[PDB]
């Protein structure tokens, strides 16, 4: 799942040329990607 | 030399209960023995126990006289501290607060009495489970009125509670009695005798009008230490420099050690 | 971005002046005040 | 202990360094003085 | 660890002999209402005591003298008065005393005070302002009871004091209205034991009168390079506590 008021940021991007590019992107993108790859490696694992 | 006591706290209790007791800054406790290294169970209510049995209001009084009083001032964010007040002479005057609803004046004689007005702010604990009790700070003058009328029912206990002050009337409570509180009555069954000698029959030879000197000296010393054991003895003295002249309940004050 | 946020306590400190009097005595100066404050979010929409 | 419903395993948490249960000096077995510090080991009152 | 000071406010244009009497008056013990660095004169005069129309009798004047703060007067600038405040723990001064009592004193004994019952012989009568400044006595705490009980044992019948080797010899008439029956009540309560509001008086009133007539000493004498006996009217060193 993805939580509301945080699923809303990745449901669409209305930003254009953000000034502070590091404040609220990596704590969202990395935090969600460490999960988006756990679900993928889950298929790599459940075969065993 | 202010003999310092260090009572550092185990960490099992979450950081909330340190800010829940930080409303208890500058309050007194009574140590059984004295040493610069101690623990937290040393002054929890379970340490004031007797026989493994819950003490009463009376067997809690004779506990104070033996155990030393000290003034805590500051909760170090890691440990605790106390200024041993009974014997040594701390040059910087220790701050206390008056948890008892009774107004103070500049120059009072405060003593230690277990709570009677109805409720206090003793704190419990959920990890280690230590119940630390507090005493109250009160003037000697009204305390001598309290102990009389508590023993007034203590002598009814082995035979067969409202006081006025400040325009106020505060009740007191009395636990279940112990058949040995004997000793709590043996404070005056020995004292009433040492008040009368051959010079006290003439004190009846002049009654309808309102070898004698020895009864006019011997009785005087008796009268000071009739309640010194029957109660306790003021350990401090109050004085303020340029604050408001009246100390209210629930607030700090400035005292000095006798 | 006041959207990907839950709460904040922006607490500040003030002074407590002490009028220097005549010959000394123990007064034991106060330390700080350190009041903490809560944050509350409202919002408003339109219709068109 | 009032937390009997908040745990799913604690026996391995509660059996390391329990305090002493009796005096270690007396010619007899007296009780534990409240000024004790000895962490004796007790597998006996563990499972009863 | 610094000492306390009390500064007394003096009026102006006083006669040049009473203002000299304050040059004759140094070393006495003065009792203070509250410790204040800005202090007037009248506050340590007899008029700022417990007056209910009359200067306070010793029956409660002793209670005041014990409840009130203490001090020792020292050298006096022609302008203002300097006196050291004692009773808090003021550290290690060169503190002396002037004994104001008809009794004698030796070296190595505790000194306390008591309210005067004898006279008003050494106090200052400031007839210009109409205000009286009074002072207590200084007796050893070996005689605190042997000075009090001995004069009132005489005062019970109507209704020689020895120390160091000198064979020497109103405010009391109110005090005996609370003591004659203070022991007759023990006599009665011996029969009353062998009621809940009968023990309500005696234990509390006896204790109100007991702590106060078993007083403790606040000064003790000391001399390093000097005599070992101090007569009434000297200036010799002591130590607080």
UniProtKB/TrEMBL annotation, chain D:
<protein>
    <submittedName>
        <fullName>Major capsid protein</fullName>
    </submittedName>
</protein>
From TrEMBL, chain E:
<keyword id="KW-0167">Capsid protein</keyword>
<keyword id="KW-0946">Virion</keyword>
<dbReference type="GO" id="GO:0019028">
    <property type="term" value="C:viral capsid"/>
</dbReference>
<dbReference type="InterPro" id="IPR002690">
    <property type="entry name" value="Herpes_capsid_2"/>
</dbReference>
<protein>
    <submittedName>
        <fullName>Capsid protein</fullName>
    </submittedName>
</protein>
<dbReference type="Pfam" id="PF01802">
    <property type="entry name" value="Herpes_V23"/>
</dbReference>
<dbReference type="GO" id="GO:0005198">
    <property type="term" value="F:structural molecule activity"/>
</dbReference>
<keyword id="KW-1048">Host nucleus</keyword>
């Amino acid at each position: 799942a993805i939580a509301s008021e945080a699923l809303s940021l990745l449901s669409n991007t209305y930003v254009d040329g953000t000034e502070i590019d590091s404040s609220l992107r990596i704590r969202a993108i990395q935090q969600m990607a460490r999960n988006l790859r756990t679900v993928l490696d889950s298929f790599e694992r459940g075969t065993a | 030399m202010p003999f310092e006591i260090e009572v550092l706290l185990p960490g099992e209790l979450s950081p909330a209960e340190t800010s829940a007791l930080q409303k208890c800054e500058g309050k007194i406790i009574t140590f059984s023995t004295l040493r610069h290294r101690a623990s937290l169970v040393d002054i929890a209510l379970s340490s004031y126990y007797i026989n493994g049995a819950p003490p009463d209001t009376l067997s809690l009084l004779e506990a104070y006289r033996m155990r030393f009083a000290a003034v805590i001032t500051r909760v170090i964010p890691g440990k605790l501290l106390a200024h041993a007040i009974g014997v040594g002479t701390p040059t910087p005057g220790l701050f206390i607060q008056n948890t008892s609803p009774v107004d103070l004046c500049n120059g009072d004689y405060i003593c230690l009495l277990p709570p009677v007005f109805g409720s206090a702010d003793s704190i419990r604990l959920d990890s280690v489970g230590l119940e630390i009790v507090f005493p109250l700070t009160i003037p000697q003058t009204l305390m001598r009125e309290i102990i009389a009328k508590v023993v007034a029912r203590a002598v009814e206990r082995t035979a067969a509670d409202v006081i006025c002050y400040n325009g106020r009337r505060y009740e007191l409570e009395t636990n279940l009695q112990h058949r040995d509180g004997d000793a709590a009555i043996r404070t005056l069954v020995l004292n009433l005798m040492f008040s009368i000698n051959e010079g006290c029959l003439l004190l009846l030879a002049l009654i309808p009008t309102l070898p004698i000197y020895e009864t006019i000296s011997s009785w005087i010393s008796t009268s000071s230490r009739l309640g010194d054991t029957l109660g306790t003895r003021a350990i401090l003295r109050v004085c303020v420099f340029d604050g408001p002249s009246t100390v209210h309940p629930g607030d700090r004050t400035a005292v000095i050690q006798v | 971005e006041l959207a990907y946020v839950r709460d904040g306590v922006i607490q500040f400190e003030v002074q407590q002046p002490m009028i220097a009097r005549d010959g000394p005595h123990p007064v034991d100066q106060p330390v700080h005040n350190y009041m903490v404050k809560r944050i509350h979010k409202r919002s408003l929409s339109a219709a068109f | 202990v009032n937390t009997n419903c908040n745990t799913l395993d604690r026996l391995l948490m509660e059996a390391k360094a329990v305090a002493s249960q009796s005096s270690t000096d007396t010619e007899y077995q007296f009780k534990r003085p409240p000024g004790s510090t000895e962490m004796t080991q007790d597998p006996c009152g563990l499972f009863q």
